């Protein structure tokens, strides 16, 4: 059923587009200045804040880049937003940029300070997918969460308590948790945890176990290809009418869109452009914990590890100066594409028979199997 699912999500994409365009028209930005992932970000956050303000806005004058610090009527923003979505709320839409931010953060940063202070092993990176993602996120917002993500929550919810309505949360938070697991025991053991009203160290210690079980017997976690507002704004402006032509977040749609995107980014004096593009690209598909081998395979070019990556973050801090600042064009194109999955595999070869698709292969017709016998460069982005 390609009617609701493909076209209803198109309608949520149209909203973000339309809105971004309107909002650019207010700031009186240029074309080059609307394609600046920097400005796009600021706008996206202005909105999520207002639906739950001001921000950094970079301008282009003869030669150099000027940063403007601006503020907007928190309600005006909310007004312009609905205008774009037909006076609807389109929580999906806000939630979408809620993820784009997530997926960018799960790749720009490593959240160790928090894992340990919770009592999780820092080496449990690959399980913290969406730890940044506000609880306000929707139902299809939590499905993107890693097993480890859930644990850090319950453990804190439990840790402060064990140190009214709060109960329905805990059970559900576990049901979700449990719905991540895809094996008998895994599934059953989650229940043995959900049994205690005041679950103390008994649970505290047990879930941590299950956290580690997922390192081997992974769960089902959905991945959503969520592109920056500018990319959708630009697309909408170019005529693409997604609600009518359909769109996906786990199909070929997102890759294809990024095959024509003209996104620019601010880049510090000593930073490596190629390295910058890589980052953004990995946030566009939630590939921050993917096997570097495969990421590079599909990417088309080396996908260098975080340590060897030359960049500190895409957003520009108030500390820095503009004099020594310039901007590059982000390389977001990829070689092939792949069905962003949810499954963690089980039996060691996973996704037996599943392959990669050419960017011409619109339909999921002919699959391609990668052979990794090769001089690779690692598997752990972190």
């Amino acid at each position: 059923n390609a009617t609701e699912i493909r076209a209803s999500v198109g309608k949520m994409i149209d909203g973000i587009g339309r809105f971004y365009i309107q909002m650019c028209t207010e700031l009186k930005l240029s074309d080059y200045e609307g394609r600046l992932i920097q400005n796009s970000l600021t706008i996206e956050r202005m909105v999520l804040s207002a639906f739950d303000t001001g921000g950094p806005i970079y301008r282009r004058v003869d030669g150099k880049w000027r940063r403007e610090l601006i503020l907007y009527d928190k309600e005006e923003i909310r007004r312009i937003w609905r205008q774009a979505n037909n006076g609807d709320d389109a929580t999906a839409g806000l939630t979408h940029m809620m993820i784009w931010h997530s997926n960018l953060n799960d790749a720009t940063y490593q959240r160790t300070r928090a894992l340990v202070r919770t009592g999780m092993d820092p080496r449990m990176c690959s399980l913290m997918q969406g730890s940044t993602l506000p609880r306000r996120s929707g139902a299809a917002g939590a499905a993107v969460k890693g097993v480890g993500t859930m644990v850090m929550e319950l453990i804190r919810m439990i840790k402060r308590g064990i140190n009214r309505r709060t109960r329905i949360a805990y059970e559900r938070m576990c049901n979700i948790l449990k719905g991540k697991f895809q094996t008998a025991a895994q599934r059953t053991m989650v229940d043995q945890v959900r049994e205690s009203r005041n679950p103390g160290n008994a649970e505290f210690e047990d879930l941590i176990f299950l956290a580690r079980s997922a390192l081997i017997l992974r769960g089902s976690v959905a991945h959503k290809s969520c592109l920056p507002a500018c990319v959708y704004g630009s697309a909408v402006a170019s005529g693409y009418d997604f609600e009518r032509e359909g769109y996906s977040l786990v199909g070929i749609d997102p890759f294809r869109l990024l095959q024509n995107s003209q996104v620019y980014s601010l880049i510090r004096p000593n930073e490596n452009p190629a390295h910058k593009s890589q980052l953004v690209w990995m946030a566009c598909h939630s590939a921050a914990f993917e096997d570097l081998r495969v990421s590079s395979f599909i990417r088309g070019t080396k996908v260098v590890p975080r340590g060897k990556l030359s960049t500190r973050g895409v957003q520009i801090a108030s500390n820095e100066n503009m004099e020594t600042m310039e901007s590059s064009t982000l390389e977001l194109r990829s070689r092939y594409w792949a069905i962003r999955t949810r499954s963690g595999g089980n039996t060691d070869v996973s996704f037996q028979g599943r392959g990669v698709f050419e960017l011409s292969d619109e339909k999921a017709t002919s699959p391609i199997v990668p052979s990794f016998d090769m001089s690779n460069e690692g598997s752990y982005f972190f």
Binding site: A287, S350, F351, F372
Partner: peptide
């Protein structure tokens, strides 16, 4: 250490999953 130990899979392909 302080590094990764397993790979979270993002795509559907024939891939030995590292841990």
């Amino acid at each position: 250490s302080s590094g990764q130990i397993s790979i979270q899979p993002t795509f559907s392909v024939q891939r030995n999953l590292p841990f």
